[PDB]
Design a protein around this ligand. Structure first.
Ligand SMILES: OC[C@H]1O[C@@](CO)(O[C@H]2O[C@H](CO)[C@@H](O)[C@H](O)[C@H]2O)[C@@H](O)[C@@H]1O
Ligand code: MG
Lengths: 412, 553
RNA sequence: UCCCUGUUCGGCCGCCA
RNA sequence: AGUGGCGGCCGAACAGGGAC
C-alpha cells in the first residue's frame, strides 16, 4: 500500500518495441518457471495484444549458480527515460571509490521486487516469452513492480535505500558505497580478511530490512595501464624502420611531441626491404626522445560527464586482448590488456564476453557510466552465443566494426 | 445477445478520429449479393443497423471466385487502419513441419468464420460503420456497424490469436499429454492415445470449443495423411513438400525465372543439393518483367541437373528429442552450400541452402562459418538446441584460421568429415620480409573528376612501370598497382603499398571475390611461392613509396 | 568525393483467409 | 479496387565507422 512515484517517457518518444530473438529450450523452461512464481506472487501479470510494446528477455546463469537468473534487455527502454534518471532523480558519483584498495560487488535486485510501480508506465515494460518452433504464441507479461535491470528503478528506490544503509554509514565512516542499476559496490581500505567480514556485516544489516542477497571482489588500485611500446633492437632492417615510422606517425595523433623527420632520412633510397641500416645519431636521438614522450600520459585529456563513453577492443592473438576507453578520438581516458582469461585458447566469444564484462565494471567504478562498445566480431556470431557466456546483470550498448590491423599498435 | 468470450479493448491513435470516405461505383451483378449477405450476417448477429448519428463510414465491395459461386466480402479499411493503434503481433513466425515431434494421432481442425466469431470491443464498433445500397442509384441505403472482428482490419489477426490463446489455455492444463499447436485458423491436435480414444478427445475439444462459439465442421477430411497444409504433404511417419511443376518453355521470360527460382528455393528444404547461383545470375540487372533473357551455358547447366534432383520424390523424418542433432555440409563451388540435419543417418530431417556471397571478398573459411551461423539459428528456432556439426574442413585448417584472424570467430562443437571437396586456405602471406626477392614499392592515384588515373611500382632493382587507367576510382587504382607487382614479379616478391583498403582485403586470405579485379589478385597470389606484403604510411617520404606516388599522380 | 557494414521505409510475381 | 503473413525481385530514405 505504498504511494507510486509517477513515470513518463522523454518528450515525444514512443516506448520500446524490440523483437524477441529465439532462445535455447534450456532458457525457456526456466523463464517459464521464473514467471509462474513471480505471477503467483503478483510481481507480474499477463497481458494481451492490446499492448504493442515489448522488450527482450532471456536467461543467464550467474557464475556457479545452477539456479537460473532472469535478465531483461532494457537498453531501448532505458535510453528513453533519460531525463528522469539523469536530470531529475540521478545518482552522484564517488570519485574516490576508485582509489579503494579493495571493492566488493553485491546484487540488490531482490529489493526491486517489492516497491510498486506507477500505473501509466507498466505498459512500456512488457516482455514476451517465446516458445519453440512458433507453437504457442508468445506468452506476453508485464511488470507490476520496479523491474530488474531498468535504469529508473535505482532512481526511485534510492530514498528507501539511504535509510536502510544509514545505520551502517555512520558505523563505518571510511567505507565508500556506490549503487548502479541492479548492483551495489561497497568499498573500504580494510584488508581482505577484515574486508570480507564487513560485507557479511552489510549483508545481514541489509538482510534485516528485507534485501535478500543471492564474493565478487575488485581491486581498483592494482589496476595497470597499457604502454604504447616501441621495439628495442640491436639491428634494424629497412623493413623494421618502415613499421616503426608507421607507428610513430600513427601515434603523432595522440602525443603531439613525436617526430619522424630524422628517421625518415634513414630510408632515403628505394632500397630492398631486408637490408640492415646504421642509425644516425640524429635518429638515435629521435628514437630515444620518442621512447620518452610515451612514458607520460596524454595531455589535457579529462572526463566530460556530458559525453558518452566509448570502448574499442583489439584481438591481439594468443588469448590476449587490448582495449581503449575514450570519449573523443585519440584522447584516451584509459588503456588495458587481457590475457588467457576463461575460455583461453579454446573459445574467442567466451573470451570477448569476459572482456566486455570486465571492461564495463572498470568504467562504472571510475565514471558511473556503461561505455559504448565497438565489438570486433560479426553480428550473428555475437547474438547467437553471447548470453551463454554472459553473467552480468546489466547490458552495455554495442556496435560491430569491421577493422583490419592497419597498425597492430598496442603490443606488437 | 452480448458476446460469449471476453472483449479486447481497442483505441484510436492519439488525437485522431474515425474514417470518412464515400464508396466506389459497382455493377448491379455484385451489389445484389451483398444485401443478402448483410442480413445473413445480421441474422447470425455479426452486424447491426444504425441511424445517421455515426459520422464515420468506410467503403465496401466484393470479388467473386472463378468456377465457384461463393463471394468474398471486402472492406476498404485503409483509413481506419491508418488511425488504428499499433499492435504487437503475437505470431513471431510460421511453424515448420520438420519441428513436429512424433505422435500416434494427428487431427487437423478448421475454425469456421474465424474472425467473425470474436467480439469487437463495444467502444470501437462505431468506426466500423459502412453503407450499402440495394441498387446502384435508386435506394438511398442503410448504415450498419460491426459486432465482430472484421475481415480486413489491422487487429483482427493479432487479437484472434490472443483470445484463442485464452480459449485453449485451460484445455491444455486439463490434458497435458495432448498437444495443440495453433497457427491462424487451423488447429493441430496430437496425442499418444489410440486412434479410437483420439476420436473421443476430438469430440471433447470440439465441444469445449463449441462452449465458446467456435464451430469445427465434420465436413473436414478425417485422419487421412497426407494432410495438405502450407504447401506440404504430412504423412504418418514421413513428410515432403507438395510436388513441383516446372514451366517447360522453349522461350523464357523474366517472369519465368522469378517464378521458377522460388519453386527451386522452396524445393531445397527437403530435396538436398539444389543450386540456383547462375539462374539468378541472369536475373541481376533485369529491368522488365516480361522481356526474355537467354540462359547461358552455366545457367542452362543449372536447370538440367536440378530437374534431375526432383525426379525422385523425397521425404524427411520428425524430431526425436532423445537422439542428438547431426548437421552435415557439402560444398557446391561458386560460393554455394547445401546442408542436411538428421539424427539417424540417411533419415534426413530437413535440408537447406546458404549461398550469400556476403562481403565483397570472402573465402571458403569465412563462408563455411557463415553457413554454420545460419544452420545454428534455423536449428535454435525449430528444435531449440545447437546440433552437432559434420564439417568438411580439417581440424588443423580451422585451428590456423581463428588463431590468426583478427575478428573473434567461434563454431560450436563440430567434427571433421572427409567428403571432398575439403575446404582449405589457398595461400598465406609471409610474416617476415623475403630476402633475395625484388621489393615492389607500389602506389596508385586517380582524379575523381576525370576518372583517369595511374597505377605502378618502383622496385629495388630499379624497375618501374606506370599504366594509365580509364573510368576508374582511387580505390580501384590502388587495387591495380598491386596486380602489376604480382604479374611482373618472380615466385618470391615483396610489396609496399600505402593502401589500407588493399592491405585489408589481401590480408583476409580471400579466394572468391565479386570484383573481377580482386579475382585477378587472388590468382597471382595462389601462383607465387612466397609473398610478403607490408604497409607504409603515405606522404612521409619513406623510401621509394615517396617516389612512385609522383609517377602515379 | 570513396568503400564496406548495419538499421528504417517503399514497387511487381508466386501462396494463404 | 481490403488486410496481414510467407517465399522471390528491385530499389528508396536514415544512421554507423572507416579510405581520400
Ligand atoms: O546488436 C544490436 C542489436 O540489438 C538490438 C535489439 O536487441 O538493439 C539493441 O542494441 C542496440 C545496439 O547496442 C541498442 O542501441 C538498442 O537500443 C537496443 O535495442 C537490435 O536493434 C540490434 O540489431
Ligand atoms: Mg598515393
Amino acid at each position: 500500500p505504498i504511494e507510486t512515484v509517477p513515470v513518463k517517457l522523454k518528450p515525444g518518444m514512443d516506448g520500446p518495441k524490440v523483437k524477441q530473438w529465439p532462445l535455447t529450450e534450456e532458457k525457456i523452461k526456466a523463464l517459464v518457471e521464473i514467471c509462474t512464481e513471480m505471477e503467483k506472487e503478483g510481481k507480474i501479470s499477463k497481458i494481451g495484444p492490446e499492448n504493442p510494446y515489448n522488450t527482450p528477455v532471456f536467461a543467464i546463469k550467474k557464475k556457479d549458480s545452477t539456479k537460473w537468473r532472469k535478465l531483461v534487455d532494457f537498453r531501448e527502454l532505458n535510453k528513453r527515460t533519460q531525463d528522469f534518471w539523469e536530470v531529475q532523480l540521478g545518482i552522484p558519483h564517488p570519485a574516490g571509490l576508485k582509489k579503494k584498495k579493495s571493492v566488493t560487488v553485491l546484487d540488490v535486485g531482490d529489493a526491486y521486487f517489492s516497491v510498486p510501480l506507477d500505473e501509466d508506465f507498466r505498459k512500456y515494460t512488457a516482455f514476451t516469452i517465446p516458445s519453440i518452433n512458433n507453437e504457442t504464441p508468445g506468452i506476453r507479461y508485464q511488470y507490476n513492480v520496479l523491474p530488474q535491470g531498468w535504469k529508473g528503478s535505482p532512481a526511485i528506490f534510492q530514498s528507501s535505500m539511504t535509510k536502510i544503509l544509514e545505520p551502517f554509514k555512520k558505523q563505518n565512516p571510511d567505507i565508500v558505497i556506490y549503487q548502479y542499476m541492479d548492483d551495489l559496490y561497497v568499498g573500504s581500505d580494510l584488508e581482505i580478511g577484515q574486508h570480507r567480514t564487513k560485507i557479511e556485516e552489510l549483508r545481514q544489516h541489509l538482510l534485516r530490512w528485507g534485501l535478500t542477497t543471492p564474493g565478487y571482489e575488485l581491486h581498483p588500485d592494482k589496476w595497470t595501464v597499457q604502454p604504447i611500446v616501441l621495439p628495442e633492437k640491436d639491428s634494424w632492417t629497412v623493413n623494421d624502420i618502415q613499421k616503426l615510422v608507421g607507428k610513430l606517425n600513427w601515434a603523432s595523433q595522440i602525443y603531439p611531441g613525436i617526430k619522424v623527420r630524422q628517421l625518415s632520412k634513414l630510408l632515403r633510397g628505394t632500397k630492398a626491404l631486408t637490408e640492415v641500416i646504421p642509425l644516425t645519431e640524429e635518429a638515435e636521438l629521435e628514437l630515444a626522445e620518442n621512447r620518452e614522450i610515451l612514458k607520460e600520459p596524454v595531455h589535457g585529456v579529462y572526463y566530460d560527464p556530458s559525453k558518452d563513453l566509448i570502448a574499442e577492443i583489439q584481438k591481439q592473438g594468443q588469448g590476449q586482448w587490448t582495449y581503449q576507453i575514450y570519449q573523443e578520438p585519440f584522447k584516451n581516458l584509459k588503456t588495458g590488456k587481457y590475457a588467457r582469461m576463461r575460455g583461453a585458447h579454446t573459445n574467442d566469444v567466451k573470451q570477448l564476453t569476459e572482456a566486455v564484462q570486465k571492461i564495463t565494471t572498470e568504467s562504472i567504478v571510475i565514471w558511473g557510466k556503461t561505455p559504448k562498445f565497438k565489438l570486433p566480431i560479426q553480428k550473428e556470431t555475437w547474438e547467437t552465443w553471447w548470453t551463454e557466456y554472459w553473467q552480468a546483470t546489466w547490458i552495455p550498448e554495442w556496435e560491430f566494426v569491421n577493422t583490419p590491423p592497419l597498425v597492430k599498435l598496442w603490443y606488437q | 445477445p452480448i458476446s460469449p468470450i471476453e472483449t479486447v479493448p481497442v483505441k484510436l491513435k492519439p488525437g485522431m478520429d474515425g474514417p470518412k470516405v464515400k464508396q466506389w461505383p459497382l455493377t448491379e451483378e455484385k451489389i445484389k449479393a451483398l444485401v443478402e449477405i448483410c442480413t445473413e450476417m445480421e441474422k447470425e448477429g455479426k452486424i447491426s443497423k444504425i441511424g445517421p448519428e455515426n459520422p464515420y463510414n468506410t467503403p465496401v465491395f466484393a470479388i467473386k471466385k472463378k468456377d465457384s459461386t461463393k463471394w468474398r466480402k471486402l472492406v476498404d479499411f485503409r483509413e481506419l487502419n491508418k488511425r488504428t493503434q499499433d499492435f504487437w503481433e503475437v505470431q513471431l513466425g510460421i511453424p515448420h513441419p520438420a519441428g513436429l515431434k512424433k505422435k500416434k494421432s494427428v487431427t487437423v481442425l478448421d475454425v469456421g468464420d474465424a474472425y467473425f466469431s470474436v467480439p469487437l470491443d463495444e467502444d470501437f464498433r462505431k468506426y466500423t460503420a459502412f453503407t450499402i445500397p440495394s441498387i446502384n442509384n435508386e435506394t438511398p441505403g442503410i448504415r450498419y456497424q460491426y459486432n465482430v472482428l472484421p475481415q480486413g482490419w489491422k487487429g483482427s489477426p493479432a487479437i484472434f490469436q490472443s483470445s484463442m490463446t485464452k480459449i485453449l489455455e485451460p484445455f491444455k492444463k486439463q490434458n497435458p499429454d495432448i498437444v495443440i499447436y495453433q497457427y491462424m485458423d487451423d488447429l493441430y491436435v496430437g496425442s499418444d492415445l489410440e486412434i479410437g480414444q483420439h476420436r473421443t478427445k476430438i469430440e471433447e475439444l470440439r465441444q469445449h470449443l463449441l462452449r465458446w462459439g467456435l464451430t469445427t465442421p465434420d465436413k473436414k477430411h478425417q485422419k487421412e495423411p497426407p494432410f495438405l497444409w502450407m504447401g506440404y504433404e504430412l504423412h504418418p511417419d514421413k513428410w515432403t513438400v507438395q510436388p513441383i511443376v516446372l514451366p517447360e518453355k522453349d522461350s523464357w521470360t523474366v517472369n519465368d525465372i522469378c517464378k521458377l527460382v522460388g519453386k527451386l528455393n522452396w524445393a531445397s528444404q527437403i530435396y538436398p543439393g539444389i543450386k540456383v547461383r547462375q539462374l539468378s545470375k541472369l536475373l541481376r540487372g533485369t529491368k522488365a518483367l516480361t522481356e526474355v533473357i537467354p540462359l547461358t551455358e552455366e545457367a542452362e547447366l543449372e536447370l538440367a541437373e536440378n530437374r534431375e534432383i526432383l525426379k525422385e520424390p523425397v521425404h524427411g523424418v520428425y524430431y526425436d528429442p532423445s537422439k542428438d542433432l547431426i548437421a552435415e555440409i557439402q560444398k557446391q563451388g561458386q560460393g554455394q552450400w547445401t546442408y542436411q540435419i538428421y539424427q539417424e543417418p540417411f533419415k534426413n530431417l530437413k535440408t537447406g541452402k546458404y549461398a550469400r556471397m556476403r562481403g565483397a571478398h570472402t573465402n571458403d573459411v569465412k563462408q563455411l562459418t557463415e553457413a554454420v551461423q545460419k544452420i545454428t539459428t534455423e536449428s535454435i528456432v525449430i528444435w531449440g538446441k545447437t546440433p552437432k556439426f559434420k564439417l568438411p574442413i580439417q581440424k588443423e585448417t580451422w585451428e590456423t584460421w581463428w588463431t590468426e584472424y583478427w575478428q573473434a570467430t567461434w563454431i560450436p562443437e563440430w567434427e571433421f568429415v572427409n567428403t571432398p571437396p575439403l575446404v582449405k586456405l589457398w595461400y598465406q602471406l609471409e610474416k617476415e620480409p623475403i630476402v633475395g626477392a625484388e621489393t615492389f614499392y607500389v602506389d596508385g592515384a586517380a582524379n575523381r573528376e576525370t576518372k583517369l588515373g595511374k597505377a605502378g611500382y618502383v622496385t629495388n632493382k630499379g624497375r618501374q612501370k606506370v599504366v594509365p587507367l580509364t573510368n576508374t576510382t582511387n580505390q580501384k587504382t590502388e587495387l591495380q598497382a598491386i596486380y602489376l607487382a604480382l604479374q611482373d614479379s618472380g615466385l618470391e616478391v615483396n610489396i609496399v603499398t600505402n593502401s589500407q583498403y588493399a592491405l585489408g582485403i589481401i590480408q583476409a586470405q580471400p579466394d572468391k571475390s565479386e570484383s573481377e579485379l580482386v579475382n585477378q589478385i587472388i590468382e597471382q597470389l595462389i601462383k607465387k611461392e612466397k609473398v610478403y606484403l607490408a604497409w607504409v604510411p603515405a606522404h612521409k617520404g619513406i623510401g621509394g613509396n615517396e617516389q612512385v606516388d609522383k609517377l602515379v599522380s
